[PDB]
Write a structure and sequence with these properties.
Structural class: alpha/beta
Entry title: Crystal structure of Schistosoma mansoni HDAC8 in complex with a formate molecule in the active site
Assembly: monomeric
Bound molecules: chloride ion, potassium ion, zinc ion
PDB class: hydrolase
Shape: globular
Distance between the termini: 33 Å
Helix content: 25-40%
Name: Putative histone deacetylase 1, 2,3
Keywords: Histone deacetylase 8, Schistosoma mansoni, Formate, hydrolase
């Protein structure tokens, strides 16, 4: 069974943000137009019984002042109420400004994603679903008491927390962040824990957001940080130079995902699948596609994870070419069904007739309009193997040690 999170209030809230507008609608209406909805099981967003029960759910990761400020900021924006100097300092202190500004529904729009992923996480716990999807989730930048990257409440953190806090021996989660940007928020949320392994495959360069997930800084030469305390060696990162395509990206992360699955054997796998690595994203950093027989990098990684047959949570994320993000994630969904229920779904190369059909112009095709073309990655593989060795030793883990090396 493959679950997917939708609902009228959910659809209204995920489409009420200023940055992502109606992206969530184009995504779900295109999944609907390809007749995939009947094969999917609708997981409804979580809802609490009291305000107190909501706060205790959300302040599982965030602090109460930040959540209070975030609710106040929605209150102030609703009314034409102006922000006093004291209100300005309060908001600034949680970085709710500039890149993460308030709007009439900033708290309800942030909370929706926390509901979707928590619901998707419980769906996996009770074995109702083998894999759950939440394209209105995956905001990996939100931190305990600060907003970043138009991520206000970190749904991913909350959904992982729920997973590890559930009887299996000892539950362990593998987190895999395919977004262009570094999964900093999910990574310091478990920085100190060895039971949640975070691996992010992003772009890094001077001045590029968020600027973490790579060598830092004095101690003469700089080191590459990978967790702390009893969670040392638990956070993995693969920073890639701009202009990588499907093939190299796939060869880049392929061996790293197999190693992590072998050595860790996670109870659950959470996948952030931000679509801003597409060649046609305004960022214009990576050159991935959504092609499927030169197979797409995303789909390649998704297949590799599904083959593990571990309960998997697939979340959306970044992605600012709305129709092309829809193209990508519709495919990701078809794959998920094919790979879980064993049912092969054939998707016509022509975009079906539906509400947002005009947006997919002027060619109205399922593949994004990009013709691909085109080693420090070796250095990273070696560093990542050693780290992986240092991690299994630290946590008294046994593994082939030979088959993992053969993977490269
Ligand atoms: Cl397919
Ligand atoms: K990433
Ligand atoms: K960690
Ligand atoms: Zn991103």
């Amino acid at each position: 069974s493959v679950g997917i999170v939708y609902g009228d209030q959910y659809r209204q809230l995920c489409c009420s943000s200023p940055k992502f507008g109606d992206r969530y609608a184009l995504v779900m209406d295109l999944i609907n137009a390809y007749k995939l909805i009947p094969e999917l099981s609708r997981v409804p967003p979580l809802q609490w019984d009291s305000p107190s029960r909501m706060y205790e759910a959300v302040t599982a990761f965030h602090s109460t002042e930040y959540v209070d400020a975030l609710k106040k900021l929605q209150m102030l924006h609703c009314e034409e109420k102006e922000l006093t100097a004291d209100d300005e300092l309060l908001m600034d202190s949680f970085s709710l400004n500039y890149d993460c500004p308030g709007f009439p529904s900033v708290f309800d729009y942030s909370l929706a994603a926390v509901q979707g992923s928590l619901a998707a996480a419980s769906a996996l716990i009770c074995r109702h679903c083998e894999v759950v999807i939440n394209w209105g989730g995956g905001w990996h930048h939100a931190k305990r008491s600060e907003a970043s990257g138009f991520c206000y409440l970190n749904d991913i953190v909350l959904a992982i927390h729920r997973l590890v806090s559930s009887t299996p021996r000892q539950t362990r989660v593998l987190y895999v962040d395919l977004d262009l940007h570094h999964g900093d928020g999910v990574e310091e949320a478990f920085w100190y824990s060895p039971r949640v392994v975070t691996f992010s495959v992003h772009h890094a360069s001077p001045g590029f957001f968020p600027g973490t997930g790579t060598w830092n800084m004095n101690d003469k030469l700089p080191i590459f940080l990978n967790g702390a305390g009893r969670g040392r060696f638990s956070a993995f990162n693969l920073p890639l130079e701009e202009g990588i395509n499907d093939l190299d990206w796939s060869n880049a992360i392929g061996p790293i995902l197999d190693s992590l699955n072998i050595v860790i054997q996670p109870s659950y796998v959470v996948v952030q699948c931000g679509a801003d690595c597409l060649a046609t994203d305004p960022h214009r950093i990576f050159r991935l596609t959504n092609f499927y027989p030169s197979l797409s990098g995303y789909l390649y990684a998704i297949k590799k994870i599904l083959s593990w047959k571990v309960p998997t949570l697939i979340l959306g994320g970044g992605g600012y070419n709305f129709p092309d993000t829809a193209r990508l994630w519709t495919r990701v969904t078809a794959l998920t069904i094919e790979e879980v229920k064993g049912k092969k779904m054939t998707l016509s190369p022509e975009i079906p007739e539906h509400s947002y059909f005009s947006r997919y112009g002027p060619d109205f095709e399922l593949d994004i309009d990009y013709f691909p073309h085109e080693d420090s990655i070796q250095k990273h593989h070696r560093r990542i193997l050693e780290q992986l060795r240092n991690y299994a030793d630290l946590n008294k883990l046994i593994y082939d040690y030979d088959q993992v090396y053969q993977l490269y």
